[PDB]
Amino acid sequence: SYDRAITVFSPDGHLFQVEYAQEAVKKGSTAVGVRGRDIVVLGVEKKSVAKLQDERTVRKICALDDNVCMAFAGLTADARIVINRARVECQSHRLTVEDPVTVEYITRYIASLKQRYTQSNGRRPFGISALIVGFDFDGTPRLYQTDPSGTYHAWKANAIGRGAKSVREFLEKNYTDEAIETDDLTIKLVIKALLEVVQSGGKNIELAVMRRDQSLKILNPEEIEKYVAEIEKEKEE
Amino acid sequence: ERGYSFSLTTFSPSGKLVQIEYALAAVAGGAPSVGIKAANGVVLATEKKQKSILYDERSVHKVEPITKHIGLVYSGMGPDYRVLVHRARKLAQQYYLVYQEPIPTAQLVQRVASVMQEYTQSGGVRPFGVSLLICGWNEGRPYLFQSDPSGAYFAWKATAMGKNYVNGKTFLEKRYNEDLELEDAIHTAILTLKESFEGQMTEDNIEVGICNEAGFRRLTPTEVKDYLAAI
Amino acid sequence: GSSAGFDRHITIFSPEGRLYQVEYAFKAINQGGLTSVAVRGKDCAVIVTQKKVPDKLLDSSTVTHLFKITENIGCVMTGMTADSRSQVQRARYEAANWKYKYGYEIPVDMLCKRIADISQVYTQNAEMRPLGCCMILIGIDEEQGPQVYKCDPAGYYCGFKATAAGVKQTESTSFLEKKVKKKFDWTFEQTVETAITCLSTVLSIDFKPSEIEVGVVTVENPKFRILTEAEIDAHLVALAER
Amino acid sequence: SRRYDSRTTIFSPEGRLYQVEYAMEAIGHAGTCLGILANDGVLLAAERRNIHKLLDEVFFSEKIYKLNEDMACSVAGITSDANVLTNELRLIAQRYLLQYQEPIPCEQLVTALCDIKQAYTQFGGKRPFGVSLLYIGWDKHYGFQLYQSDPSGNYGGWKATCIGNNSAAAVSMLKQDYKEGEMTLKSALALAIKVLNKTMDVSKLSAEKVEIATLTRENGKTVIRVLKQKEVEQLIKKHEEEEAKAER
Amino acid sequence: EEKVREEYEEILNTKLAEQYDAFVKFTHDQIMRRYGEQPASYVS
Amino acid sequence: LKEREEKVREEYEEILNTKLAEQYDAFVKFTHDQIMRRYGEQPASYVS
Amino acid sequence: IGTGYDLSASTFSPDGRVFQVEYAMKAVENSSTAIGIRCKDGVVFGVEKLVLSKLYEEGSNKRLFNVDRHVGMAVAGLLADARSLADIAREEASNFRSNFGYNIPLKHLADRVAMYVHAYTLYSAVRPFGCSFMLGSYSVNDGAQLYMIDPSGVSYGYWGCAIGKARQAAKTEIEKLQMKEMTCRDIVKEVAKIIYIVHDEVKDKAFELELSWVGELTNGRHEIVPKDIREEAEKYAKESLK
Amino acid sequence: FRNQYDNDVTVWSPQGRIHQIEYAMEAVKQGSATVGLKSKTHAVLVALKRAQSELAAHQKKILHVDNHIGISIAGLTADARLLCNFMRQECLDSRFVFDRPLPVSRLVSLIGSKTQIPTQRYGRRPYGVGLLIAGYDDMGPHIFQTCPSANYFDCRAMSIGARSQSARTYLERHMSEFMECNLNELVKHGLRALRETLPAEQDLTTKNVSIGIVGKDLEFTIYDDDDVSPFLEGLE
Amino acid sequence: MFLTRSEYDRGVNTFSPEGRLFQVEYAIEAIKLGSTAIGIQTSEGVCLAVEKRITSPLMEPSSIEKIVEIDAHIGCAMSGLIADAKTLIDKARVETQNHWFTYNETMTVESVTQAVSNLALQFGEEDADPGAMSRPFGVALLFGGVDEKGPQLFHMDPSGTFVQCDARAIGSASEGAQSSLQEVYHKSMTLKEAIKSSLIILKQVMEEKLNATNIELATVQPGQNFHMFTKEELEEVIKDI
Ligand SMILES: [K+]
């Protein structure tokens, strides 16, 4: 079996393979996630807008479970692998512990898997960064990310992929107690965050929403267009 | 003791497996081998130009039977041909044990090609340096195949491989048609070998094998003498 | 002789299809400094090798290149000595296993093919080097008569009417070819004559009996026998009188 | 040995996998294979690159491989890796059939093969499968489907796509000419012939140089039929008439 | 005696390493020029 | 004894020149084969 | 000569030389010389065991091992590899006695250990042993035997051999002996003489002579030379060295 | 490319040397000084415990191995602990199988073989630790030195670590007395040798010296900060 | 043979000419990039403090845990690549619970630190099993807790060297914090003084301003168990500065 140490410490203490996985993440499509009072919203940029494609097959927001869902930036196939293992682990935890997985538990599992690939023999780190959202059993919304290095943190709102810094600055300047008062305000906040980096509005936005005791809902293009129109009127004033 | 676990064959920046190209170069540098699919058989011919009279021509053979109805010839590195012949015999026997029917020639070609593919991608190994011509008669129809070092198999009606293989292919292209019987195919294969043969070609410096309804068999030197005299 | 990549270090193809490690293994065969000559006749096979004793402190009984594979097959090894001993040990094992599994003694061509397959494995994989030694097996087949076979590091094997391997295999090959083309019905005496004559005319030595080794098999006596100093001296005297 | 290791499964300084990219260049130099999803069927059209007239073409097809009762695929790239991948695809489809006693949904088979390709680009040091496939199928869930796969293990559901030599031009033509949800089997066949005309510029698009197979549904049974020489000739002649009529 | 040979071998190794590094960086420059223009399809 | 040292220096210079030439030949063959594709070159028999 | 083809024992030089094995031999010729001489009734070993610091105890870093009840072992080169090979030889003799039920012939122990060390001259995953060693035994039904094994793995019988820095001088002075007619009681004296001749008192300051014979005098048991006989041998060697 | 003779343990230099072994020897040489002695009835190890900072307790250097044997480490401490665990396991196995203490020389031979194994395999590295092994068995007091080269020495006294040459010089000049010394003046000689390593601005304190003694009727006991005082008093 | 980069010309288990494993030195360099951590072992407890290093206000400090609980009597402050610290924390927890299961007694802090430190150089290549680590852990840990010997503080670096420290500072600002702890430490200083001193040092070394949400402080007293301070409990000591 292959046992070369792909990820090794470089001088100055950098793990180059992890940094390169992060660079691959930086070239992925922008993904934004915002945690509201009673709704959690995930949004992804679609550079692959090409019209000869089945939108169902390139979804970048996947439901890890009935109460957990994630969006990724980076390599698509590695994201598929991590999503599949996360679903398997969710179902295993539900058998063994009787209860639905908390968001932080599956986030820890995904982070541990990425870190293990960072340090195990003969495999490169996962070139994906995630945004694991969902609701806990006690009704507390959550939002985490998992970088390729394996570090996971909780965020009120974050962006991964290209334009992460721009959208992160926008969210810093535009995440207040009022901006997440209602569901529509959260939807519009995520859409406005994406519009800071997407080429054209509406057509390049994939937006999924999760609220209490309801499964993930993929907002259809018509709803995205009507929301974007609402931001257009709001910006006019 | 543990072998390397990484592919020696990898994609070049041009987008091409250079090791397979170099294996094909070794194939193109070997003794010419020709195969002609007649309407009632197929002939496999190659030259046995030993580099001294000291070599015993009957000691080693380049046209090796695999089953009672399949034979093969190569153009490249002899030891790799021996390895692939042994593996093809193993695969044929496994098929016979499973299905109690002689292995179809297409199936044997597919399995040999799978072995070649394995050696193209597996760790610490180099691709085989032989292209095979697998001949067989089954389902009342002659067959002729060519398996390049990469493991890609092509159905052929007539082909030449080795030195002057492009000129031999042009020769065959000019002088092959559907209605050839086995004897005409043998004559044409001998002429194709002659087209690149250097010096006088005799019984012991060419090896010819045929397969028909009666099955596959190497032509004995006396029969090759009879066919050579016909020119 | 183009080169790109590690093709001169591990057994991978050069751009012209050449494996340079195999050719370097042939050079390693040459590195031994000795040459060996084998020739078969009507009812015998003879292997004659160059026996050099660099130091008078060696036990000359323990410096040999003729090895008895089985009770009926002989072997002369040219090249690196440790590799040659590995190959002879492997040949002994394969022959014994053949007898155990199949109930009859291994044919010489079969043993040469097994050793050649092992050599091919060496020249296919990348982590072990080929053995820089060459094997010349002799024996009597029940149906086909005397057998002379040779296997080189490339994995090639073939039967020979008369062959040679070592530092002077080309000159010996030319001489044996000139003698073979005549086809004058070799006997045991004539076979040992032509082997010793080839070795001497190529090396220009005129051996005393202690500078060569002779191993013979015969249809009358299929036992492999390593000729002693008396027999070799008798043959050399026969050379001298002519 | 680290000296001889080619480091196939590592990242580049700029964060890309060189081996996958090189395999994709190899595929981009391979035979053109395009598929079009129609309302009543889905078809695969593949340029044959070996045209030499000493070939026999004994088998069912040379590019189109039947994967199960209800699915088929084409290949652009290395043929031997294609063979191992298509064998693995057949194994996966039959494993679902054994486990669930029903045909495998197309996306599941694509996902399994793509997961294997991901494994080969994730660990082990082995070179990736330089094969991009082009799947056509049908299932009781999403009807007629067309799927693309990449050496990196990526896949996408396409309604019209082309892989191989001159793939970009074919994709542009398909984008211009594909009519959403209004393309029948005959319209798709005509579009395929037209696209292959401007893709095989050098070869002038004879019927001996293309292999077309259609997947339709008849009486609850899926039929995968390779188009005959006569009817491919008819398609080409009809396209020639239409091209001449354009001059009018 | 042997030290002179060792020093000459070290100098030769250093020079060969410099030339080989030049070759490696040149190939890397060509590859980065070649594959930088188009975006990777797999990353998304 | 310095004559042997000068001879060793000359041999080292010749060896360095030969090694540099061989390395350059290897590099140019590498560039011609693995890189620098030709537009008019159809792929080999194994690409289909 | 190298710098591109001397990185692994699994690589052949363009002229067919495995440079790693040659570097192991270079390692073994930079060690203190160990000599062994075979006589009518046994073999006597001798070692110029240098004492690197005087803080060591007399008998530290022995180079005369005892691999079986009737076989000795003199070593030169890296002592870690010498001890590892001593354990390998001990295990081979133990396994031989366990399976075949009698003492291993030294002609077979030498072959087994030589093949073991040859296995390390083929692969890039391992390195050749940096120690050449001698084996010596005496049995009434097989006589006195002396064999040398070097990093390549070649085994030859010797009437007398030397391994280490002063191999050439030791062999030159051993040839002056007539060991074929002498007995152990005199061969030990001459071994001390040879070791003291080949030793240089200006480069390596101090050394202690380590002697051991196996032979008829010891019923086949390989024993360290008794203290009184060692004192007499050193007395003779010093007087001769004048 | 690079020096191509230094990275791998399985690559011989054209001079017949393995540079990785020498680099592990350097690892031993960079460690803090240890010095050990032996009388005809005792074997004493005294080590110079080094402190990372003025607020950090000094590293333990004498480690228990068995009822009747002990070691003093110098080099990589994790390698030292792994080799110490191997030694302890071998001693316990000898006590289990034979119900007798394991002879010191045989234990050192096992250490030599175990440390030689990685000397010859690809990817492996030499044990970058040098061990001063002092034990008492039927053959009297023993002191041993083991190098990363898997070569071990039967010593009468030895010092390994940083500035060890001064301690070795002191030991050499005063070897003749060690045999007839009692425990107190034997450990005084050891402390003098260890002081010879220290620079001019420092001297032995109960903080930076540890003493391990094994003898005829003496459990191997490591003497620590408070307990070193009776041996320390009376040097200078 | 071209395009090979010198990143992998050396193996993982290779020594430098100075006798230091290259990977261990690189992991030590990685330690100097982590958040600063401070620990003081007083006679009435052990205190551990670490900066959170909040990159952006959207990140919740409650999630970024750089101090953890090995058991009721052991804590751990981590600096460096926190992703690598979790394997060691899990191993320490497993060892503590195994020791309780087997012996019915709390495992000594020194024994826990030793058990975790044995993992530090257990990394390699093909020589080992598939589950073997490929690189040293880029984490320095400050184990602190109370046991039979009283309050204990330990420091383990990637080299596997674990050493008992009266007051140790690790992370980016290790040197300045260590000099300050030298200036302030007395063998008879109380836990309240230790906490105040540690927070003062953190304020001196932190780039961000010290507040109740950008540090974590925990104590292990000979009485009560491992305790994580909170808001309304960390302001009560921050205000004094
Ligand atoms: K090889």
Side-chain angles (χ1 to χ4, degrees), chain C residues 11 122-123 125-126 128-130:
Chain C
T11 316
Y122 296 142
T123 65
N125 297 319
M128 79 281 282
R129 62 164 178 84

Side-chain angles (χ1 to χ4, degrees), chain H residues 8-51 53 55-146 148-181:
Chain H
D8 292 307
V9 178
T10 70
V11 173
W12 287 94
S13 167
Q15 289 84 19
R17 295 210 269 91
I18 307 164
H19 290 158
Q20 273 304 290
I21 309 296
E22 311 186 64
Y23 298 170
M25 293 180 183
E26 272 296 320
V28 165
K29 270 164 202 263
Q30 294 297 109
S32 68
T34 66
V35 65
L37 283 72
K38 64 151 182 213
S39 65
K40 64 183 181 293
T41 64
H42 289 81
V44 59
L45 292 160
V46 298
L48 175 79
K49 308 158 53 144
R50 185 179 288 162
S53 75
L55 292 162
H58 300 236
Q59 269 287 113
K60 61 180 73 174
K61 292 178 70 67
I62 319 295
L63 299 168
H64 277 54
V65 169
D66 189 358
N67 191 359
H68 77 300
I69 194 170
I71 59 168
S72 182
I73 62 170
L76 274 67
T77 57
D79 274 326
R81 294 192 313 250
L82 172 65
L83 212 62
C84 186
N85 283 288
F86 168 76
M87 299 179 68
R88 295 171 170 166
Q89 193 44 230
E90 291 305 10
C91 285
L92 294 174
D93 290 331
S94 167
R95 281 249 170 79
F96 187 84
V97 178
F98 302 112
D99 213 348
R100 65 134 166 77
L102 184 65
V104 178
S105 301
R106 310 182 162 178
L107 178 58
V108 185
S109 196
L110 298 164
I111 294 148
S113 299
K114 205 253 193 180
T115 49
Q116 193 278 348
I117 291 299
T119 301
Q120 192 144 357
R121 293 182 184 271
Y122 202 57
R124 301 299 279 296
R125 66 163 175 82
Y127 277 74
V129 59
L131 288 89
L132 271 179
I133 302 162
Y136 187 100
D137 63 49
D138 291 331
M139 283 267 298
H142 286 296
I143 185 165
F144 282 85
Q145 168 203 37
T146 64
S149 78
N151 208 1
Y152 58 89
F153 310 88
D154 189 358
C155 317
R156 304 211 280 271
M158 183 71 36
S159 179
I160 61 171
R163 292 172 290 279
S164 304
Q165 183 54 290
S166 62
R168 281 203 283 284
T169 301
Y170 176 90
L171 294 168
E172 295 170 294
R173 68 184 68 188
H174 293 164
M175 294 177 71
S176 310
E177 327 187 12
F178 297 149
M179 294 299 291
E180 287 302 12
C181 295

Side-chain angles (χ1 to χ4, degrees), chain G residues 36-57 59-189:
Chain G
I37 291 141
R38 171 177 157 199
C39 50
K40 291 177 70 68
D41 53 69
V43 299
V44 191
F45 289 101
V47 168
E48 65 183 1
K49 195 203 92 64
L50 300 168
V51 298
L52 277 296
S53 66
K54 65 179 73 175
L55 288 160
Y56 302 143
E57 182 65 26
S60 177
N61 313 67
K62 324 182 81 83
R63 284 161 101 240
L64 284 190
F65 299 132
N66 204 345
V67 306
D68 181 69
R69 76 211 309 192
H70 69 98
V71 185
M73 167 155 165
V75 305
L78 278 187
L79 209 49
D81 312 317
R83 302 175 147 114
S84 70
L85 289 187
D87 293 274
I88 301 299
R90 281 174 205 176
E91 187 176 0
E92 289 273 30
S94 187
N95 295 349
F96 191 101
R97 184 180 300 118
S98 279
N99 299 124
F100 304 100
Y102 79 113
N103 299 350
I104 187 166
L106 191 142
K107 183 175 174 66
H108 195 228
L109 182 69
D111 274 3
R112 291 314 285 283
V113 189
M115 300 306 323
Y116 186 81
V117 301
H118 161 84
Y120 280 75
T121 61
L122 289 158
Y123 309 98
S124 73
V126 301
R127 67 154 178 75
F129 284 103
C131 57
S132 68
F133 59 98
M134 321 175 69
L135 291 154
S137 184
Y138 175 83
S139 69
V140 64
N141 277 292
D142 291 331
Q145 296 295 108
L146 172 59
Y147 278 59
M148 182 179 72
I149 299 90
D150 73 27
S152 179
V154 305
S155 285
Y156 293 126
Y158 289 77
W159 281 102
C161 171
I163 57 173
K165 293 187 286 185
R167 184 181 41 280
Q168 192 55 254
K171 292 216 294 177
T172 300
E173 281 263 341
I174 279 156
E175 276 156 358
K176 285 196 249 155
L177 276 61
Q178 279 187 33
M179 72 291 291
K180 292 181 181 180
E181 294 294 328
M182 293 177 71
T183 75
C184 281
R185 292 279 309 99
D186 291 331
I187 291 297
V188 57
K189 291 183 46 39

Side-chain angles (χ1 to χ4, degrees), chain B residues 124, chain C residues 9-12 21-22 119-130, chain G residues 10:
Chain C
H9 295 123
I10 61 166
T11 316
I12 58 172
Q21 283 283 82
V22 178
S119 302
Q120 195 285 329
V121 172
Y122 296 142
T123 65
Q124 163 84 60
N125 297 319
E127 79 272 351
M128 79 281 282
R129 62 164 178 84
Chain G
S10 76

Side-chain angles (χ1 to χ4, degrees), chain C residues 189-220:
Chain C
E189 260 288 354
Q190 301 184 261
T191 307
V192 58
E193 293 293 328
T194 183
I196 296 173
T197 309
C198 175
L199 196 65
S200 169
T201 189
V202 173
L203 300 164
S204 315
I205 302 298
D206 285 329
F207 313 112
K208 64 182 181 293
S210 65
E211 307 182 46
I212 49 171
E213 301 187 90
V214 179
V216 306
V217 293
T218 294
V219 177
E220 292 292 328

Side-chain angles (χ1 to χ4, degrees), chain A residues 57-73:
Chain A
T57 66
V58 299
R59 283 193 212 290
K60 284 202 211 333
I61 312 173
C62 295
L64 294 191
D65 200 13
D66 189 359
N67 78 88
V68 192
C69 70
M70 65 179 288
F72 65 91

